[PDB]
Design a protein around this nucleic acid. Structure first.
Lengths: 88, 100, 51, 55, 117, 271
RNA sequence: AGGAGGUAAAAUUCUUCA
RNA sequence: CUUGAGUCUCGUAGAGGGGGGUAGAAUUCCAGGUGUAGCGGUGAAAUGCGUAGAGAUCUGGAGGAAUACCGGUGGCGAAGGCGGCCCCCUGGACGAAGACUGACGCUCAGGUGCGAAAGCGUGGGGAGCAAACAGGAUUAGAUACCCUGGUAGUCCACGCCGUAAACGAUGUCGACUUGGAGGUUGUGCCCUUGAGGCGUGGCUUCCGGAGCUAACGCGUUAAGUCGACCGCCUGGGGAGUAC
RNA sequence: GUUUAUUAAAAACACAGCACUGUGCAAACACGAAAGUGGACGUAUACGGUGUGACGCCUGCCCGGUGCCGGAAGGUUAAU
């Protein structure tokens, strides 16, 4: 579930510094990472429903997180969607 | 890169080739910067039940810290090699020593 | 299961069956398959194992 | 008990027929029971512990 | 014909009939005898006594080979499971070994159902 | 791969194509081709001995080797071709000597395999060797009845044989028909199954879909007249006769097997 | 005393209101 | 802003799910050797099977499916549901502390997805079991219970069906409220000096308080005591039917 | 689509499909006193005969007579 190497790596790219994984940008970032990783996971098998709700839960999670960030600071929202590459 | 028990048994007739197996095996592993903390050869030991005819086989314990890659393509060599009878890789949980 | 008597006797003395196989696990897998029904049976008997 | 290779410790936890002895007799612990059974299952496969006495 | 001394007593007692066959140390069967073959039809042979006389029936047909001793492998529960081996011993046979070979599958085939009585 | 066309037109909606992507597209291997004309159900006397034979699309023969004498000489499957003459697919294999030959491409066959024949050939699909060296039970196709003749048993698509006996210098084979015929182990065979199996999944779709194949319309005995067929002509869908051939031969059960020569090589008839 | 096994084959129907 | 709700570090347990292999026993089929009139079955028989040699017995082979013992009011998941062993991939839950984000929460018509068994479509496979069906018995009648056979099906890939006593017949989440006996999984402390001793969390089982209810009962996991929201009922039959 | 060229072009025939049955190769069958050939230089997912006639829902009851597929104690029974 996302190596600790990638996790700590992402945190030091969105948040002001380390240990700042709590930041909204960090979360939505580490979440999308898996959504893209597991993305290929489901590309195969395709019969894994139990683990499917999990991926959906991850997206539905960041989704609500985006509305919040977009609610507070709009700038931080755009600078996130264009960077992370999503929303279309 | 995790640990694997690995405990196969070679046919009593191909016991002279056994000492060679460990060579290529350990070689293929070390080739990918693998590891190795234990290697035992109990030798021709008694069997519990008549497996694939003939009694008593040649057991060869093992213990390597190879990645989940070179290890997956290891059983393919055992299955292809009619010499060896059984084969089994177990858990990981760090490494061990001696015992048995 | 098996018995290797000594010498001074001919009597069976094979009362080992009445403590393992024989019918303790044979009669079980003899009739219906049950499946989920056993749970209720064991639960019923387990409820009488208290007093 | 804590391993399967230690057949010298798992040979006294099984009946003469090879059937795994319950915790009711051995008086073994809970967590140690499943581990003890899990060890036997592994040994049997590696032809370490006969499944039955018929052999 | 022939002159063996060590054989085997493959008995197969069931909830209907008990078949006893005395073979050699090779498993070729020298002579057999059923509880039903010696009469007793229906519940008549579904008794321990049916197997008793059955053993003597197989005995008085295999002794022609001079069978001194022989093993005994029991198979199938039901009556005539104990009384069977109790006959050969009294028949004059030197009982040596007694092993059970009742087919016990590790849960594979699906048993019947119809039995509502 | 099976495909079901859509109802774009009548006689096309009941069509079920059976194409194969791993099948070569183009001209076959000329060096292994010949004339192979079309008779038409007639013999030297020009008489139509076998009815329902005519028309059909022009076909060519494929030099296929069923004997497989090239022992101790490995070979690589270059590709898979379509053989109209048969219902199975042929494989153009290339041995290490440079010689090419056609063989009934087994089920698990691919382009780039290493097959070989001989009393030393590994037990695998695509290899040929005497049943005397092939383990019992091994599913084998293209079996022979005589050592040196050639494979004649299980040559169609989806068909296969299974060795299940030995005894002496012979072996009993379980023919796909369900019959167990005895054949001397001295006869070679090819492990694995035959070609495709989707051949029976076909349904043509229309009448003309059976004309260009070599089959002609079928006439009923009840439709014909008594002077032509024993079933008489009738006067409005009549019969009253016994299901027989247009020559006076009972059918629907009436067995017509007379050999006594190979009856010994038989264990249990089909069922 | 605890446990296990064994131990029954089929045999219908009886008006309405009090 | 941090106590709600999440993220992060380490570690632990599991028939959770998906995919690919593998092992043993037994049954059935088949082959060889030996052997011979019985076998098989039922309450009693019979149909059936057998002199083309069964059953029984010994050896070998193939195939399908299910995993004895372990195994237990034991474990896991939202529910349905889920049991040999091993590898690969993967979800969620939980615990010992600290740090961080800072209500980012709960529920939720429509809608969407999943969803036992049975059934259906395109194929494969098919040991056993087994609707329909066939042939014997029982009976006043037997289109059933019983016996001998046996197709679909059960199995597998893909695409549909979305139905159940799909229940704990109790929707989900949060807070508060006397206890006792067990199961199961972490963790702190102590001559580890007893296989333990002294505490603290998650989950689960039985019983039992107040209270609640028509009663049965439930009873810290509530049908108790409250709050938020959705669905649903308004006599039974009609009918889970008609348009 | 085919058919009574030259009074009938139709509900007839053919038809893909489905079913039963025969066939283990020197096949069954067919043309032939025979050889030989066709069937097929194919091998049960093949081929021949018969029946029905896309598809959808389904295809019941009955084995005496007449046939076919087996077994079989006894009885009758040709040539010699």
């Amino acid at each position: 579930s996302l190596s600790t190497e990638a996790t700590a790596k992402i945190v030091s790219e969105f948040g002001r510094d380390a240990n700042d994984t709590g930041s909204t940008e960090v979360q939505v970032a580490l979440l999308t990472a898996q959504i893209n990783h597991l993305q290929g996971h489901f590309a195969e098998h395709k019969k894994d429903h139990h683990s499917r709700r999990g991926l959906l839960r991850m997206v539905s999670q960041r989704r609500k997180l985006l509305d919040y960030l977009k609610r507070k600071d709009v700038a931080r929202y755009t600078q996130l969607i264009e960077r992370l590459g999503l929303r279309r | 890169m995790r640990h694997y028990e690995i405990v196969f048994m070679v046919h009593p007739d191909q016991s002279e080739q056994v000492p060679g197996m460990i060579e290529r095996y350990t070689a293929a592993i070390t080739g990918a910067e693998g590891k190795i903390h234990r290697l035992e050869d109990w030798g021709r030991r008694q069997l519990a039940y008549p497996i694939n005819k003939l009694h008593k086989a040649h057991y060869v314990l093992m213990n390597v810290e190879a990645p989940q890659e070179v290890i997956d393509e290891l059983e393919t060599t055992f299955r292809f090699n009619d010499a060896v009878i059984r084969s089994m890789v177990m858990r990981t949980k760090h490494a061990v020593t001696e015992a048995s | 299961i098996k018995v290797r008597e000594n010498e001074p006797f001919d009597v069976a003395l094979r009362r080992f069956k009445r403590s393992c196989e024989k019918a303790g696990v044979l009669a079980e897998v003899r009739r219906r398959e049950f499946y989920e029904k056993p749970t209720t049976e064991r639960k019923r008997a387990k409820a009488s194992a208290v007093k | 008990e804590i391993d399967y290779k230690d057949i010298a410790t798992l040979k006294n936890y099984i009946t003469e027929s090879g059937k795994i002895v319950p915790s009711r007799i051995t008086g073994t612990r809970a967590k140690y029971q499943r581990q003890l059974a899990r060890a036997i299952k592994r040994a049997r496969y590696l032809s370490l512990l006969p499944y039955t006495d018929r052999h | 014909r022939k002159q063996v001394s060590d054989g085997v007593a493959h008995i197969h007692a069931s909830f209907n009939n008990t078949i006893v066959t005395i073979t050699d140390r090779q498993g070729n069967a020298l002579g057999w005898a059923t509880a039903g073959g010696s009469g007793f039809r229906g519940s008549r042979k579904s008794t321990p006594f049916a197997a008793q006389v059955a053993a003597e029936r197989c005995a008085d047909a295999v002794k022609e080979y001079g069978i001194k001793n022989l093993e005994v492998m029991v198979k199938g529960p039901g009556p005539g499971r104990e009384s069977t081996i109790r006959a050969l011993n009294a028949a004059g046979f030197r009982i040596t070994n007694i092993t059970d070979v009742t087919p016990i599958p590790h849960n594979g085939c699906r048993p019947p159902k119809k039995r509502r009585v | 791969a099976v495909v079901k066309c859509k109802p774009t037109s009548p006689g096309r909606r009941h069509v079920v194509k059976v194409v194969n992507p791993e099948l070569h597209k183009g001209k076959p291997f000329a060096p292994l081709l010949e004339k192979n004309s079309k008779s038409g159900g007639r013999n030297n006397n020009g008489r139509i001995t076998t009815r329902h034979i005519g028309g059909g699309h022009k076909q060519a023969y494929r030099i296929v080797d069923f004997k497989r004498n090239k022992d101790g000489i490995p070979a690589v499957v270059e590709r898979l071709e379509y053989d109209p003459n048969r219902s199975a697919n042929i494989a153009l294999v290339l041995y290490k000597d440079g010689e090419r030959r056609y063989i009934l491409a087994p089920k698990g066959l691919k382009a780039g395999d290493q097959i070989q024949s001989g009393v030393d050939a590994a037990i695998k699909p695509g290899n040929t060797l005497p049943m005397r060296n092939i383990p019992v039970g091994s599913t084998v196709h293209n079996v022979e009845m005589k050592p040196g003749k050639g494979g004649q048993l299980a040559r169609s698509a989806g068909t296969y044989v299974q060795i299940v006996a030995r005894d002496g210098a012979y072996v009993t084979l379980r023919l796909r028909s369900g019959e167990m015929r005895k054949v001397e182990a001295d006869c070679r065979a090819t492990l694995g199954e035959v070609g495709n199996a989707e051949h029976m999944l076909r349904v043509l779709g229309k009448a003309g879909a059976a004309r260009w194949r070599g089959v002609r319309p079928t006439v009923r005995g009840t439709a014909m007249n008594p002077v032509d067929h024993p079933h008489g002509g009738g006067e409005g869908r009549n019969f009253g006769k016994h299901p027989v051939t247009p020559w006076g031969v009972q059918t629907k059960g009436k067995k017509t097997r007379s050999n006594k020569r190979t009856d010994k090589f038989i264990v249990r008839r089909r069922s």
